[PDB]
Amino acid sequence: HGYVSAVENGVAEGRVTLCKFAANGTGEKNTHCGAIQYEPQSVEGPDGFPVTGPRDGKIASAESALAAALDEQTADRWVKRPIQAGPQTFEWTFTANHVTKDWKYYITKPNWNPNQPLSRDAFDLNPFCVVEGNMVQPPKRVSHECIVPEREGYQVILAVWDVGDTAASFYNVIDVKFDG
């Protein structure tokens, strides 16, 4: 159990994280998140996106009944966090730092449609960042240095934490705003 955070080093909090914790700097929160707002660490879903795992339209919730509210997708629905292309650091905070297979990060395609539910077709399925977990426990907070591709405007990053000793992964979408 854990979530994408910006407590020590991260560039942008997960969408679910902002249902509970105020955004760095602005204090913005996401609203009307349903029950997941009390446990942003619990967006747990089946392994194997995009081959298996959460189906289209259920990616942001990872098919969790707790997090169903996160599957809404419009241009204005969610708090967007500023980002730039190039080197950036993403951060996970774990309430339970399970043995880890890897972390993978995907970004939406340049001309994705922010006004329809998220789907495999919205994302570049070639992950822009992969971090090996080596089937060991990570520390309770980790920072991953990634190269973020060039984009304009509103984009979504999908961060996947694959727990190595269960058939489950944690799925945190991130709402980011590039210049332009």
Q: CB 1 → Cu ion: shortest distance, Å?
A: 3
Whole-angstrom distance, CA of residue 133 vs CA of residue 131: 6
Distance in Å, CB of 171 to Cu ion, minimum: 13
Q: Does 167 bind Cu ion (CB under 5 A)?
A: no
Which DSSP string corresponds to 79-124? --EE--SEEEEEEEEESS---EEEEEEEEB-TT--TTS---GGGB-
Spatial separation of the C-alpha atoms in residues 12 and 77, rounded to whole Å: 17
**Shortest CB 138 distance to Cu ion, Å:** 12
Tokens representing 176 are 């980011």
The reply to whether 163 sits near Ca ion by the rule CB under 5 A is yes
| Sequence-distant (≥ 6) Cβ neighbours of residue 180 within 8 angstroms | 152, 153
Site pattern 1..20 for Cu ion (x: CB under 5 A): x-------------------
Which does residue 29 bind out of Cu ion, Ca ion, none, counting CB within 5 to 8 angstroms by kind?
A: none
Q: Among 7, 85, 96, 136, which residue interacts with Cu ion (rule: CB under 5 A)?
A: 96
Shortest separation between residue 167's beta carbon and Ca ion, angstroms: 5
Indicate which single residue of 28, 39, 47, 124 sits in contact with Ca ion (rule: CB under 5 A).
47
Q: Which does 141 bind (CB under 5 to 8 A by kind): Ca ion, Cu ion, none?
A: none
56: closest CA among 131, 125, 103, 150?
Answer: 125
Interface ranges with Ca ion (CB under 5 A): 47, 162-163
